[PDB]
């Protein structure tokens, strides 16, 4: 099952990351970031407007998420 | 194993199975790493052993002398002096609310620096440095174990302790690394000796980077030249200012904090060396 980090922030965004089971990262797109629909389908559960914003290539099962503040 | 009786199993330190044993001539008590070597090709002579041969030479009081090396049927026995304590173990044993006596910290760090300077010095790195590698005797002496073993060779949470003591050069996918990695590790260890806590306590490579950045600031080319060229650098990283390090650690005079700050400089060309660190005001007692 999926691990969800605590949240953290800049002055500009808030952030969190989610660790997927390994197995599944075969099927995380490598050459593009995911829409909301796209990541929900993997079974990620979170509020609206979190944006898949980067990939750490050596840990492709770790989805990195970011959302603007006020 | 002619000269040695196996007394008992005592773990699996990343390389081998580790055993306790005794020398039948001298009665000496020893630690024995048993290592099964990959079959090798015809001509191709093994650089792995070449390295180990050379590491056998090294004696210094603050390193775990590799006493002997032996060859059975394609397996390799590394014979070390037997120490029953290590620093990870030690730190765990401290009762809650108490801290390591700040002069013992200072003692320990110096000893650690001396062992690494020696190694460095001899063209040899650690790489995988961390508290379970720093052994201790009853005499209160501290010693590096497993120096240069990485070089001589090359599952996954086995990696993910090792992560906390790991330099951001290595984490960002830097083309080459050198002695500055061992100093970084030693800085992270220094902080832990004071606080009892790991300094940068990450759950993954990427969370490790982020932890480091939250405390030291997100690096750019101003603070770390050529950083933005590294294979895993990204301009999308969160943007933390420095950082605000005394913040993250108690039980060090300004000297300690300063020395520490110099051990955790991003730019490896600019990060303190082992030798310089041994002259820091911090060590005057």
Numbering used by the authors:
A (entry chain B): 5 to 74
B (entry chain A): 1 to 154, 159 to 289
Sentences from the paper on this structure:
CDK1 is the only CDK to partner cyclin B, which starts to accumulate in S-phase10. Activation of CDK1–cyclin B, first detected at centrosomes, signals the onset of mitosis, and CDK1 complexes of both cyclin A and B are required to ensure its successful completion. In this paper we describe the crystal structure of monomeric CDK1 bound to Cks1 and the structures of a ternary CDK1–cyclin B–Cks2 complex in the apo form bound to a potent CDK1 inhibitor.
The CDK1–Cks1 complex crystallizes with four CDK1–Cks1 heterodimers in the asymmetric unit to yield a lattice with large interfaces between the CDK1–Cks1 pairs. Monomeric CDK1 adopts a classical bi-lobal protein kinase fold that is in an inactive conformation. The C-helix of the N-terminal lobe is displaced out of the active site cleft and the non-phosphorylated activation segment (defined as the sequence between the conserved D146FG and SPE173 motifs) does not adopt a conformation capable of peptide substrate recognition. The only difference between CDK1 and CDK2 in this region is the location of the DFG phenylalanine sidechain: in the CDK1 structure F147 is rotated back towards the carbonyl moiety of V64, whereas in CDK2 it points into the active site towards D185. Beyond the activation segment the CDK1 C-terminal lobe is well-ordered adopting an all α-helical structure to which Cks1 binds.
